[PDB]
Amino acid sequence: GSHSMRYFYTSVSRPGRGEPRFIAVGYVDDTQFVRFDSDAASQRMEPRAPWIEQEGPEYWDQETRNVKAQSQTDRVDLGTLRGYYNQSEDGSHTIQIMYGCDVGPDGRFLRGYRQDAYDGKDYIALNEDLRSWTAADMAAQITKRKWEAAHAAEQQRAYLEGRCVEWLRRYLENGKETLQRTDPPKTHMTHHPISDHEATLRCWALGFYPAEITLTWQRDGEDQTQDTELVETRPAGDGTFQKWAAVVVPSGEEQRYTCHVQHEGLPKPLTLRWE
C-alpha cells in the first residue's frame, strides 16, 4: 500500500533554565522508529523500532550530527523570530517543524511536505509545487524572501524527491515484517442504562492498525450525529490503536441503532447491533 515517512521536530525555549528542549521523532506510517531528546544523557538518535536497530554506527553517527544541526538551527531561529515578533526574552516559545514524503504501492513519489509553526500557529509552509512558500504573517514574509533569496526550496525538494523516498523504500523493505501488516479491529458493544427511559450504547474497536478507521452510528440506517460521542483515536501502546463511539438511545429502542466500522484491514465493513 501507500506509505509515508514523517519527522516531527519541537524546540521550546526555556529562559533562565538552559538551552531549549529539542525533541525529534521519526515515523513510518504510524510506527515510530527513531527519537532524539536534548535532555536525554545519550546525546544520540536512538532506535525505537526493531528493524531500525540493525542500522550501522555510521548511520547513528550521521543522524545524530544532522539532528544536532537541526537543534542549533532551531535555537538561532527562536531568537530571530523573537526579534520578528518583538517578544520578551523571558517568555518560553515554541517552534514546531514537520516534514516528510509519501510513496504509492509502487514506491514512486506522491507528495512532499514541510510545515513550520511558531507558538502552535502556522508560520511558513512548503507549497505542493515544492518551489514556493506560503506565509501566514508579515514576519514569515521576511523568511519567505530570505528563503526565496537563499533558495531553500532547492535543498528541500532534492531530499524529499531523493533521500526521503529512497530510504522510505529501505525501511519498508527491511521492516516489511511489521510495516505491511493490516491489523483489523476487534469490536464489541456495551450497554449502560442512564435512567429508566434512556441508555448508553458504546461501540468499541480495539487492537487495529493503522489508526485510520471510521465508526458510524445509524438509526434505521440514517447516520446519527446528535446524542453521539466520538473520542480521539488512541494508541494501545503495543503498536495498535483503540477508538470508540457512543450514542444515547431510549430504553427499548436499542434495536433500531447500528454501529458501522470501516477499516483497511477488514475485507468488508462490520455492522454491530445490540444483541
Partner: peptide, 10 residues
C-alpha cells in the same frame, strides 16, 4: 534519514 545535511536559517 533526515534532511539533506544543510539547513537554511529563518
Amino acid at each position: 534519514v533526515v534532511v539533506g545535511a544543510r539547513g537554511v536559517g529563518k
